[PDB]
Design a protein around this nucleic acid. Structure first.
Lengths: 60, 132, 134, 74, 74, 52, 62, 102, 189
RNA sequence: GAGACUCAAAUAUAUUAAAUAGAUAUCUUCAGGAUUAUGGUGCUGAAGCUUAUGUAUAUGUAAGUGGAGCCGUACCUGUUGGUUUGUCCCAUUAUAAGGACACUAGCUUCUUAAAUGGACAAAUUGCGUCUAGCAAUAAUGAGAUUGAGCAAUAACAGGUCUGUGAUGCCCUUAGAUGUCCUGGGCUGCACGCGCGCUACAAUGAAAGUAUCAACGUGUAUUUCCUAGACCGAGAGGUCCGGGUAAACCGCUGAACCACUUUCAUGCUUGGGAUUGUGAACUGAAACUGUUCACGAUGAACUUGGAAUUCCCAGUAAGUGUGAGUCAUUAACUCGCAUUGAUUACGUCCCUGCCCUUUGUACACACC
């Protein structure tokens, strides 16, 4: 509702999923683990976002 | 002592040095306003010596009862001069010499197990006083 | 019981207040002297207003007239260092009321710092009087 | 304007009279005994402390700023 | 220590509650740990919930945390 | 020797502003003597990053 | 005139000076009258409510 | 006979305090200087707050200034001829060593 | 085993008013000894209904500024008032209190901003939350004015509204100022 | 730009972390109960008591004295010191290991971090334009631990030449506006206006007792923090320390509030302005006063008109304290903690504010 997703979490969610949908899981806690691999981040709440959004669309 | 609360446990012991002849009364016990806040005198002297119950836990937990560390922090709950209320220091006076009323340094030679334990023997009797 | 409403010099006493607080109704004495001059005149402070018959309250007048012999020190008085005749007094609506214009009328000749301010009406203790006191 | 300024006294002329009113008046308290006239405010509490012969009283509230009572209901 | 004449005593509610669980969690029994929670958790008065609600810092322009003082002939 | 009064070791005068020599706006006591408007300029690099 | 009534659906609250939920509400003995009354103050769904004036509702649309 | 030399370390950067336990204690417990671990001191935070505008005419805001100073303590039980090499190496910017002789 | 409110029983206290049942959760779930809860009772909009009542009263009577803030003084004043309400009408004073609280509900109309005008019109029914929580408010005032310049204490003053609101209230008390208000909104209605 | 980001107690000590705290453990020592077991003892004179003088009044003893207890231990409840690689070793003046034992005869819960953890949100939910279907439901340190800082383009004849050796220009300079001195004033008053203080009292003013903070701060080219004794109504003063600070002030054992009393609503004992007087402090110097003590002096003031400010959870308000300026002076400003509510969980009437549409005869734009 009121927690919309900014550009960087939106414009990186595509560019990892259309590339690394393979060997990717639905489990967010290990989807937490894979974001430090396939890209870099400066901070852990962004991996709380950029893994949370891809998993809020992964079943979709 | 760490028995039941020292409302009345202060009240009994105030009578007992008053009982035992060891009053050692200050000659201006009807003069002083016991600090720079009171509009009236106290009712009587029966607080003035009674804080041996306070030091029995303060020799136990705070310090040897130096008078400067004594008078500052207890008995300050004051409203001073009207713009606005503040804190005090209470400026004791004669109970600097209440060690004589008991007869690195230590402040009591009888409040280890000698005369404090009498008050415990009073409160052990006060257990029997409160037995009905 | 018996009579409650007594009469002392230039005052009166109500029949409800304690003897210490009804002592404050006398001019020139506050609640300081409730423990000071009543126990010095051995008046029991817990006595009600009906009590303290006149054989006891006349000794309080002797503390009023003679405060020095009743173990009242100098730094517990009304006015110290007279300096006129050097004596020390505590005055209860008899001489203190005359003592108001006294020590003012001397300083009119002196025209001191706080002396001549009493003519037009101002404050002798320093406050910025330009704003308040319209 | 209410005044209520009565003779603050031990009130012996009504002491026997306040002795009998407390039965069956179970709402006894320091206000109601001074709500009755010839007002004592403080020693009329003590008047019921003089009623502490375990008769016609039940002192159940003993506190700062209020000591609420009850008559001894049999 | 700390707290106050109300608040420091409220922490003692968390003190007695968690000690019974931890002594029952490891030493006595699983169901002994269970039988002290279920009768508690019906309403439990948050005897184990340590709310982190502490005081909120000030702001310049006010006397207090969020209030302020105004009407300079606005 | 002559015509210089004011035994300056009492009062504000003259323990004044060992960073700008300006009196009426002084931060005196932290061991700074900084004339707080000049402390705006020279906040850095004498630590004093702002945080909150 | 001691009629009680319980709410089936909230509608909008015209708040600003007199926050009141203009709510559709049916009675208990006359539950076929799902009248749309205006209730000053905070309410929840399924809340039973006392009433006397159960006749007309000060019609305002949305 | 045998000496105990307590060596306090103060600085501003916690990373430099993480840089002095990076290499000083590791080059000493090879020869067992009895460090007793990294003994943390509570920080000495320094608050200053000032107005913003010189000639303070308008909207009386303020401006808060913070400062963080941190220490960590390394005590050693060794005579003075042992610790002489450790005073030479390693050195660090902004960090201070306080060992007294007499 | 859920007993001992302060000195006496807790439950068997029913709310004798449709439609305030199951809304003022008195004692059928929450056997609380004290009027003192700590944490948080207005987080979302829905929190004043899952709570006891004397915890609100002790939250309520701390007012005036010089008395506001102090809940322990409110812990003093109502429990000693509770004995006055226990000694008279020897029924549990909470059963007096729930009968006090439903008669003091302004179960009537009020005033409301017109959707064409000002606060003129009739908020014909009031909310049960505003019915209970203003009923706390309309009695909380009248204890103070019953002891502003009277020598008497608010322990017996607050006992005076509990005895008359439990029954149908007599001539205008703190229990009133609302029944008169029922009339002037019935004038517009 | 917003966000992202940086800073703050909740977060496994699971890892190493203490001259903070200590948990503990036992060593203890500070020992009552007889709660214990009693061995000796108990009516036989115990316990308790006085007199005498010596010793420099206490103590010794007898008598005095008196008629049941006495005395030791352990258990129960308390000081203390080390319990740092524990003990016993040693070298050492004494720590350690070296020598073994418990093989742990005190470890890290704890405050402190230096870390990473940390609602880390597919969290299910008759799918809203397949996407941002509130639901409260899931957690059980975590239903944001949660406030701050940060801030673009264009601007204002906003404010600051009196913050600066920032500065154009203007003005002045042995006769200064410069400069140091002695004074004075910036404080003065029929009056108006704003921020703000204690009130106007029984929820109260007194006496008592109980007995909880936190942010901080503290002296080597300046008089700081003060411990301790001591004296003094006080004010203070003396004598002697601590401390450059997790180590001392300081476990800062803050206030309001809790608990019995005095009061008995009566401008009262509410309220302390008001004026005398002395006593004081700081400093060369105190005078609409530098402040401070006492015993007087008790006015206005009884909840404040129209108008009108502030704010949504540890918040509002009550309630202290620290710091900032400071020879002494808060009565204000920043921070700190405590006590802790009511009410909204909305809407655009209100003053509002944001490039949507439309109107114009508006320039310096509805003043």
């Amino acid at each position: 509702m009121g927690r919309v997703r900014t550009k960087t979490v939106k414009k990186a969610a595509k560019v990892i999923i259309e590339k690394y949908y393979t060997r990717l899981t639905l489990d967010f806690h290990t989807n937490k683990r894979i974001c430090e691999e396939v890209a870099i981040i400066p901070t852990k709440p962004l991996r709380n976002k950029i893994a949370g959004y891809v998993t809020h669309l992964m079943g979709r | 002592v760490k028995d039941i609360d020292q409302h009345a446990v202060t009240k009994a012991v105030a009578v007992f040095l008053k009982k035992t002849g060891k009053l050692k009364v200050p000659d201006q016990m009807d003069i002083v306003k016991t600090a720079k806040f009171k509009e009236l005198a106290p009712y009587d002297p029966d607080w003035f010596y009674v804080r041996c119950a306070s030091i029995l836990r303060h020799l136990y937990h705070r310090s040897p009862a130096g008078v400067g560390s004594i008078t500052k922090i207890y008995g300050g709950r004051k409203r001073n001069g009207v713009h606005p209320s503040h804190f005090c220091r209470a400026a004791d006076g004669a109970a600097r010499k209440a060690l004589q009323a008991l007869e690195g340094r230590k402040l009591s030679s009888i409040g280890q197990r000698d005369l404090d334990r009498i008050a415990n023997q009073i409160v052990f009797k006060q257990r029997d006083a409160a037995k009905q | 019981k018996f009579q409650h409403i007594l009469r002392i010099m230039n005052t009166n006493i109500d029949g409800k207040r304690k003897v210490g607080i009804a002592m404050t109704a006398i001019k020139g004495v506050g609640r300081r002297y409730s423990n000071i001059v009543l126990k010095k005149a051995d008046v029991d402070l817990t006595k009600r207003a009906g009590e303290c018959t006149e054989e006891e309250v006349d000794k309080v007048v002797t503390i009023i007239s003679n405060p020095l012999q009743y173990k009242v020190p100098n730094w517990f008085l009304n006015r110290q260092k007279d300096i006129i005749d050097g004596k020390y007094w505590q005055l209860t609506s008899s001489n203190l009321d005359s003592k108001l214009r006294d020590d003012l009328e001397r300083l009119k000749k002196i025209r001191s710092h706080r002396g001549l301010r009493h003519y037009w009406g101002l404050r002798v203790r320093g406050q910025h009087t330009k704003t308040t006191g319209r | 304007r209410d005044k209520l300024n009565n003779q603050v006294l031990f009130d012996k002329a009504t002491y026997e009279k306040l002795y009998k009113e407390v039965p069956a008046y179970k709402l006894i308290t320091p206000s109601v005994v001074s709500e009755r006239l010839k007002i004592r405010g403080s020693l009329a509490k003590r008047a019921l402390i003089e009623l502490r012969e375990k008769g016609l009283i039940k002192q159940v509230v003993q506190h700062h700023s209020q000591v609420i009572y009850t008559r001894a209901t049999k | 220590s700390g707290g106050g004449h109300v608040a420091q005593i409220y922490a003692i509610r968390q003190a007695i509650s968690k000690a019974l669980v931890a002594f029952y969690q490891k030493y006595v029994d699983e169901a002994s740990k269970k039988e002290i929670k279920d009768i508690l958790v019906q309403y439990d008065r948050t005897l184990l919930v340590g709310d982190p609600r502490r005081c909120e810092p000030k702001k310049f322009g006010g006397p207090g945390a969020r209030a302020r003082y105004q009407k300079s002939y606005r | 020797t002559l015509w210089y009064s004011h035994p300056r070791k009492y009062g504000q005068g003259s323990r004044c502003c060992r960073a700008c020599s300006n009196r009426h706006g002084l931060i005196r006591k932290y061991g700074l003597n900084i004339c707080r408007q000049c402390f705006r300029e020279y906040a850095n690099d004498i630590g004093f990053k702002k945080l909150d | 005139p001691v009629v009680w009534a319980r709410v089936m659906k909230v509608l909008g609250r015209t708040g600003s000076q007199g926050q009141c939920t203009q709510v559709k509400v049916e009675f208990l003995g006359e539950q076929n009258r799902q009248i749309i009354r205006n209730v000053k103050g905070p309410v929840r769904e399924g809340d039973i409510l006392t009433l006397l004036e159960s006749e007309r509702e000060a019609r305002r649309l949305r | 006979s045998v000496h105990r030399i307590r060596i306090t370390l103060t600085s501003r950067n916690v990373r430099s305090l993480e840089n002095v336990c990076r290499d000083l204690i590791n080059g000493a417990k090879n020869q067992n200087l009895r460090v007793k671990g990294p003994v943390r001191m509570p920080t000495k935070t320094l608050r200053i707050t000032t107005r913003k505008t010189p000639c303070g005419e308008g909207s009386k805001t303020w401006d808060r200034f913070q400062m963080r100073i941190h220490k960590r303590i390394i005590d050693l039980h060794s005579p003075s001829e042992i610790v002489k090499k450790i005073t030479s190496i390693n050195i660090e910017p902004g960090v201070e060593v306080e060992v007294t002789i007499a | 085993e859920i007993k001992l409110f302060g000195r006496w029983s807790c439950d068997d206290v029913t709310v004798n008013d449709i439609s305030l049942q199951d809304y003022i959760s008195v004692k059928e779930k929450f056997a609380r000894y004290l009027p003192h809860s700590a944490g948080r009772y207005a987080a979302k909009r829905f929190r004043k209904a899952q709570c006891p009542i004397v915890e609100r009263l002790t939250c309520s009577l701390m007012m005036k500024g010089r008395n506001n803030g102090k809940k322990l003084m409110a812990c003093r004043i109502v429990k000693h008032s509770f004995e006055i309400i226990h000694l008279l009408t020897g029924e549990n004073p909470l059963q007096i209190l729930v009968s006090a609280i439903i008669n003091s509900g302004p179960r009537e109309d009020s005033t409301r901003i017109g959707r064409a005008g000002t606060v003129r019109r009739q908020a014909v029914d009031v909310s049960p939350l505003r019915r209970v929580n203003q009923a706390i408010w309309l009695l909380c005032t009248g204890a103070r004015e019953a002891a502003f310049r009277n020598i008497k204490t608010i322990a017996e003053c607050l006992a005076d509204e509990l005895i008359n609101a439990a029954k149908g209230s007599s001539n205008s008390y703190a229990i009133k100022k609302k029944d008169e208000l029922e009339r002037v909104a019935k004038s517009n209605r």
